[PDB]
Amino acid sequence: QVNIKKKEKWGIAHIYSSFNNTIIHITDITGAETISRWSGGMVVKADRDEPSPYAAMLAARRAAEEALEKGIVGVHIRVRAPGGSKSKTPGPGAQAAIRALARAGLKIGRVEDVTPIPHDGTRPKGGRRGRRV
Amino acid sequence: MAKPIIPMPRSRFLRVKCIDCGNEQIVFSHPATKVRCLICGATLVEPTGGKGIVKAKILEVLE
């Protein structure tokens, strides 16, 4: 350790938000070092509970003990999701993660709309009558 | 307008008296083009939409 002047570390937390799964992933402010990666289908046994909020608090609590272990006390949250493939809108882990950070005791800085949104068109699947129900 | 009760254009005549040479010119209230003074080479009016916008102060008698 080369002398630290601030005595506070910051770890930006990418939050990747699917209706099939939730992924929480906090790194250092650069992004060049991965402390910890924890999703919503190690917590559980089944596919239905893979997303939900309750996996998306517990996943975001196991990680939160290892960031406390480094010195990272402040966190910026970068909420995002698959935009080009699917719909951009975040799933059930977005209201969930921020609740999972206020209980873990990690401070909450910036909360951010950085989700992939094309400036353009690309043809997804589903046509004639779009995707059919 | 008045296409079936006799259409008359909007027009009129006005005597313009040049400020650079005192030259008296007859001018259609709607200049379509640049009217040039015949003893200055100046521009009295410039053609824009509707009535030709008169460039700066030039004297006017309205007929």
Binding site: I4, K5, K6, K9, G31, R110, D113, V114 | -
Partner: protein, 190 residues
Amino acid sequence: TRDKWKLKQWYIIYAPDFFGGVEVGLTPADDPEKVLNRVVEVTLKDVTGDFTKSHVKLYFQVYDVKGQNAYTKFKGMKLARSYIRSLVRRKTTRIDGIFNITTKDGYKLRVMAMAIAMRRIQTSQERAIRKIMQEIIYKKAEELNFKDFVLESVNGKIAAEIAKEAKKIYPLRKAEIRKIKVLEEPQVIA
């Protein structure tokens, strides 16, 4: 992997060439010299008015690392989806205004400006507000130093100067610098 943690080095961000050594930014990493080009996002707490308020998210890049100390330049700016959606309105316009810059220092700089129009009458004066940006900007880059010229643009100074001229032509509202990207570094002589 299996760091004690003791294969974890720590560096510290000192980011000048827009301000002095902004101490903000602390770097953990594993091994020595895997960050030498890695990019850090900051709000900037140098000016706590505008640079914290409406200028959320700038990218800075550690060009070098010395004795375990990161030296960081301006690499870029980008605004959040927050900004761009909020401002725009209907029955009016949103405009976007590029210019590929050359300053006298030998840096090239790609800007995109974004102004929002005053309501009705969309016309050729729109692109002429476009034209009056690329004209004024070229001339400020040629005159001003580059380090200065990246302080001004990021500050509202540019958005302000643009507006005075462009409100004569066809009055605007909500003009900004949407994004900036460092076109070419090297120098005037490589």
